[model samples]
Target chain A: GFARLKRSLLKTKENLGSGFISLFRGKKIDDDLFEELEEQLLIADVGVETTRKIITNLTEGASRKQLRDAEALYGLLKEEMGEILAKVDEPLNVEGKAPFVILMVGVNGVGKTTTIGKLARQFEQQGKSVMLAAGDTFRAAAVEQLQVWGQRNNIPVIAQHTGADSASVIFDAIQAAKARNIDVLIADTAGRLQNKSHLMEELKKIVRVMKKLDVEAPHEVMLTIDASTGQNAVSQAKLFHEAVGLTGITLTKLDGTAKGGVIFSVADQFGIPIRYIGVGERIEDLRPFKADDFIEALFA
Target chain B: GFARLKRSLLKTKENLGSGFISLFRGKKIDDDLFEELEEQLLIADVGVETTRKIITNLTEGASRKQLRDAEALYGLLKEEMGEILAKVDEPLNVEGKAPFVILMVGVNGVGKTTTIGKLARQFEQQGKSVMLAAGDTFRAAAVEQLQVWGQRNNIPVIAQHTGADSASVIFDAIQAAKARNIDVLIADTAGRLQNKSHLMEELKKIVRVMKKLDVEAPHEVMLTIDASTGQNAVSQAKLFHEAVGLTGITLTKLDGTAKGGVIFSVADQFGIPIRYIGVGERIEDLRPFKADDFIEALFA
Candidate 1:
């Protein structure tokens, strides 16, 4: 996880994490440095509101604690970010209501299949029996569906025709999981266009159907998102939450595409449990969200 | 097309578009007003870099043009954004080389398949004979290649087993395109992690093989990016542009996503032609971008 964080956070580390140290090493920990760091955070894709909050805390902390050097000030910034991520850091709960269902949802083109599949592999490795549902019935050719598998792992997956009714497919998968006494059932749903009322209704209906079978099912509504997708992550989080209520968020460094700084905004605004972060593509690449570790690795 | 522009621009309107007119209607164009406008732009997801550029121009114009009152400055701001969007607006040349190939590339999840299909469909409808190459064998599960999507639209293609040699696949298609006098060859590539040298090396070799057939075979290297992606679009446009020497761009504006503020940064920093603006589920979704119409739509 540390190595993965180091890799995905490369651009940001160069531009932000380490880059600020140079400024700090020479200059006094004063208002100018605060301004500079504010700009740095913005470039790093931290939203304006969040950057202000960070700088405000650092200023107050510095004045209150009487910190001497820039190095300490830099460390404080790291701690500040860790504090934000810490607020929402949560590992997925695969406990209660046997066959805990993680319903994957997002807007189109986000990496759903890859994350879902990886989750299946690791859970199997953990000695937990797993099942997948291909709920992405929007695109027949949509290779992005359900708990990621079928090419190799023996983890069982339930799927319907490419254009099958999504709710039925997931409902069937949950029923089958119960019949087989599976420990976990990870279901997939179409990446709905948030504006398409009917599709959003479909998303609501999919949940409505899953509840019919097992009221406690879809125990975890995970939204798989891309790291490089900057503010759209915040926008997707806000609207999609209103639509389906995202329980867990996964930022894909599996693609190593976007600034990890955006995670600060996600942590700040939604405060949703950040279940897993993609550092690498392997099945073992997903590291459970740890706030202190994330900020430490980020600056490292 | 204007209607489509308005449709996509709707999300950004309440937050960042002509919604500014209210502030303008009540006040005069001054430093204090500019300060508020600047903050407004930042909240609208116009990053510091682009916001500075916009305000700098608007401030300069307000004084130089001897403007007073909000409405005139508001118009100036609209023109300012339009000026930036227009600078790089252009159409990809389809009439270049016979079998003018457009190699599609980007970070993995940015919808290369759907946009590739749409581009091929539009090109064929515009009277160009098209073919496709499944040069993405690296993606093992995508055996149901984008070539299938293109072929249904009447594009002849050359590809084999899911595990076929990707470069050789392109070599066959280029040879086939030349033999049959096909006008365009839209190739699908594996969406590999950008930091991986071997994968980027593979991307380089595919072009190399195409050159073995036609020195200028792949005349256009276009990238499809999501519109809502904030400053990272500038980052992607930079790094991906470095690796591939990108000639054109596609910014997909689906589901009223994105404020379109990020494009100014991408446009000003690198003068790559934004060949197409992708919209929600249209036969002509891949519309040719015009700077005037775009900025006009952006404010609308």
Candidate 2:
């Protein structure tokens, strides 16, 4: 696995250098280097505002003579990136509340249903009672997937038939959780496209209903993103944020590729804390987002 | 809306202080102001390397006493960001080719199927004959969704039953297109999670199979991303890129959120050019990505 990872890392390095070698040739981390680095970042798929911000941080550090060499500059770059991500490394703050509610939202194909399963497993592993609400009534398979996960985890799942009201399912799950004093209630909604206004409005209604049942219910609205999609993922993040006002982020499929750089850019740009990262497929693969650990793994 | 926007902009302003405000806090884009501006950007979620580059650009632009005014610095920051994004505003370059093969790939629920429908509508409006292939045989609903889009658009669709070999579906679709001399072929693959190695391998096999039929088959691999998923989209991008290198990006649900900043960060960090964006549910909501237009709307 390390060998495979090393090869992948080398490929990533090659891709990175191929994109920026000309831009960084003979450039110091001075003002000129800063401009060149911006171009490099742009080519590397970092968005404009984020690239500018990274350049600005590097410039400040350079002016202070803090980053004296390329290696030191790289270290500072990683450290600064880590710091920006650290601010939003908000994990599932499940303290002081029974049946802490977390409503998961995202467009179709982002692995939200599977992520719910993983979340349930994690909660169960922590010795907490978990109840999954299969609120994704648009697709029957989505419900079945949740059921399978529930069976695998030996946890109870609250679900209605396909095409049922997603909100009602959530309400039922909440009611059940409250009755049984489940430690957490993870609700999975239909993975509709973000552009579907009616669906988004439906999501708003779901939120409203959750509040009606319990004002503090559905406390964490997490939007899952497929990081491998690169810049498009950023756009998805924006649209989902507009639709539902996401409280936290769950980045899936990080171990498959090193485009992990997008996480730094997303955390830097959105100011939303990352709650979990799907490193692989196993129930244990969904790990909490820790800036220090992420950075270490990134450069490992 | 203005009030809400203002509140949001205020937070953005606070976050972007180093870039937009700090440069002129004491009345100058001078070295001191630039340093402070850099710090502000670092806090704003811009990575260090990119931020430093912007400062250097500002320093070089300074002709006399380094225009130490807040407004001037803001202009500089905006201009620099715009300039970087502008370089990436390449058009979707789908010209002079009949049956332009576009392969849709991404993790499940990033809206790959919806985007295909949207893309077909957009192309059909442009007077192109579009045919869709449901290459995502793992999920039954995926094929049904494509069929709905094909029926809605009055376009031909070639699809097999669920669990069919995805590559065979693409191969058949290409053959159908060739026989009919269709103008465009939009193939949809199963939106599997990135950690699903078997699914990723299936996508790779489909690409290889397409090439066997038409050496230039699957000419474009466009990855779909939900804008609302935040940083998780980045992780998915990494995984998808590893499985099958994507050629262009489509970011869905832009009109819904203020988190649009993720787009800039993704584009900046990954260097993949964004091809299209979805703002609304209507077919016409999908628009070609224009950096200037997006920036203006985002700030507006």
Candidate 3:
């Protein structure tokens, strides 16, 4: 049972496992131990300020729990890390609205297209009617790729050719889903840097257009981030949230990177729900968020 | 000329300017200041250990010089940061054997193909005969893309159809280079994870095949990193260097991100020469690394 979960976390485990296990192996609970722990977290892309926040909390936690030895601190460390993930473990709940609109966004190559495919399939197998929208009109390959996913699963996808307006594309999908009485509508957008104000402007326009049909349409703004990404993932999250207000994030590529410690910082800093995680491939590797289970596996 | 360089670094400048300036302005050079300064560097993607290293050296320099004001610390911080880049500012010199082989590798979409195109064109314009090897034969588009570059620049390209063995393609390039008396032969490999030893093994195989042609073949193992990349850029450089013995780096997308601070971490940790820096799409924007000029503009 543990093998499957542990296998998926191979890189992340190696990152957290080797360094802390050794540092905490024969060491005392002291300033040096805290410093070592801090650096180890950073190496895993836990990030600078986030690492400091975690350390400060742990230091106070150690003093409170009367942790006098390194061995005793391990439990506290796991709990502290767990608590960060523990808060925003809210999985996507498509309860209130039919054709529950999810506007998926992220920088290029973070697997947004693949993620939309996995999510749409997951919803369908659960007996929910799903529709896809190829909103990434900037790249012709992106539009065709999403259509391929739709064809594979017998789902309906609304698309315009490459260079068509993205806002109008998704707006059309929303209309089609309503006519078909679909349960979930997952729309994909072109991947671009968060700081590219022009791209960001385009996203805002999409939201504005969607509101014309349903004032509360595109119910969720989900950002798909690459797990292997470094501290700049934080900057991306912050800016993207400010521009479009992300409802949740799907962290991708945990199986390929040691930098998965970034999940903690993302959850802790933004308080956004981590809706899912992808292994860069394999729909089986894409699973729902479980903070307790994820944290337990991370500390494993 | 300096204005053009400064303008291109706008995002990077914003990353470092606002926070650090606010912290250092009219403040005492103390532990509190260092903590704030440290956070700013981390925000810029300078990373944890490198940030720690930079701060450590700056603190010592301040003490040695008996400077007690944050304003006085400015020049020291600039010089200290500059020195890290200064050490690795060695430019690529195409001065050796004919067909000086360059193997280009990086994570996919880091503009590896485009960077190869730029480098090939730049060298060709400089009166050097360049030939491109489409070693990334896995992608049909990757080969066609390079052929476009080759045709546009009137340079020769050796390539096979999609799915050809990468090493065989590069070997073919070397043999053809000798026949044509090519001055430089740049080869492109598929982008992959540095940790995936199987993928990394593919690279080692390419190098082995090259040496078969010329024991000193692939004279430069240059890594093309995205400047927008986060702290993981350092880890990428570290592992790739170990696997291929990287001689230089060409960081791309400097114009697109504020996370260019990762450059300092990469340069500081490895001491590998930074042969080139690319900012956006302008060939004129891509220039030889100059530490003094970079530092002056950074602190401007």
Candidate 4:
């Protein structure tokens, strides 16, 4: 399992994970070492606030003589970083509601549609009856993309024409999911920039409309972020969380060489549960987030 | 013009510009002030390396007893920032070669297609005959999007079916441009994550194929980055520049409330000319970047 996880985090490892070994192998615990470590974390996409928090803890430990050498410092750093992720490595449980609803949110090109497809396949394999809601009614042919995925997977997809009402489409899907006794319903919203206030208000309207059907119809609001976006993911998470109260996160595109280290900052700041990660393009690539496994893969 | 520019940079100004006024209004120069300034810059997405450089210079200035209060410190910061942008204020000139080929590059949903349309319209209004090459053959309905833009503008577009050879399509477009003696040709490539080496290599192949037609074809490789992406713009700029030797950059989505301060880091790191900025969705919203105007807007 570590082997598989390590392969998925290849680029992340290069940028952040095992690269720390060399930085800590033979050096004495000193100010220069700490400074270089700060640089490394920042370059890896850890935001300044998070890096400062991390470095401050490490510095306190070293000054207190808790760390005798760089090796001990590495141990301390690993545990501290691991602790950040540990707080939020929550797996999504699709139970309680007859048709558990997952509302997806993110900006464009973060692989939201593809991730929905992967998720559908996964839920289907678990012997759960899954349905999809093509609520992304803004982008040209976005419905077509989701419909194609639904066809390939032999799952029911609720969709409307492009430029149709996204809230109405998702509302219809919830009714269908309930009538058909579906186990899970994943709704897709148009990929919009987080900074667009009007667009964000539209998202809030979707959440409100969904509540009309069932007070808690959309149980999970998940933000699917492209790890390559770096610190921008923080901005996306903050606004999307504020707008729709995001409950889970799906970090994608980590299979690429781009460092996905921004996860540390996100986890540190928001403490949002990391539900899944798209490490590769394949269906099986979407794996549940595990704090221990992730830390081990990084150090490996 | 400055008034209009100031409105477009409303979010950026809020994050970076005159915010410094209150910080320096009646304060003495001290470590806390420097620390606060650093935090502000980082929050605005000015980036760690660039922020550090800016602060390091300011720190050195304060130590040298350059006889300055917080007011003078703000003045120096503004000038230094202005200097960074001033160095790369050079605009894109569609001259020298007949049918001056420009390749549009960026990851998906950064408004690459929209930008190409805006640039085509701008060039047409400039009395230049322009043609478009739909080289983005990977995404679903991407060609259709470009074609729609071309039709609305009444400009000719060259495209193939989805999943066609992007390089082949561009080569055909180039041939047509040369045959028609077109003044300018702008080509659109698939929006790809910079970390996807194979996708990036495909871009390199596009350049190689273009060179086969004209020794120095695709005269401009312009990256259209969404300002909302924050520091990831640096990574995108770095990899895309490595892949194709980017000649210029077009920062987009500034109308929204994104910090957009990463432009400083991008301009500081790459020194590539900023050719255009997309402040809003209108065709005329894409304005040529002017360093003096940008600084004034920021400080306004």
Q: Scoring each candidate complex against the real one, what DockQ results?
A: 0.01, 0.01, 0.01, 0.01
Better of 2 and 4 by TM-score: 4
The window of 10 residues in a row where model 3 chain A has the poorest summed lDDT is A17-26
User: Candidate 3: lDDT of A223?
Assistant: 93
Question: Predictions ranked by TM-score, top down?
Answer: 4, 3, 1, 2
Error of 1 at B57 (Å): 70
Give candidate 1 regions above 4 Å deviation.
A1-4, A143-148, A254-258, B1-300
Measured on C-alpha atoms, candidate 3 has an lDDT of 0.81
- Residues B1-300 of candidate 4 have per-residue lDDT tens digits of 657777878777776877787777677788888899999999999989989989998788667644334665764676678778877777888975778999999888888888888899989998999999988887758888788878887999999887999999999999999999999999999876645787788888998999988978889999988888887777888878887788999999887855688889989998999998888878888988877567767873
Docking class of 1: incorrect
lDDT of 1 by residue, A83-155 (tens): 7886786667696556888898877676678887788878878888888888877676663433244546777
Give the top-scoring candidate (lDDT).
Answer: 4
Worst 10 residues of 3 chain B by lDDT: B1-10
Model 3 CA deviation exceeding 4 Å by range:
A1-300, B17-19
Residue A125 miss distance in model 2 (angstroms):
0.7
Q: Give the TM-score of candidate 4.
A: 0.50
| CA lDDT of each prediction against the hidden true structure | 0.75, 0.71, 0.81, 0.84
**How well does candidate 1 reproduce the true complex, by DockQ?**
0.01
Cand. 3: chain B TM-score:
0.95
Q: How far is candidate 3 from the true structure (C-alpha RMSD, Å)?
A: 25.7
For residues B212-283, write the lDDT of model 1, one tens digit per residue: 988886799988777677666667777677776889888876446655666666777787898987766664
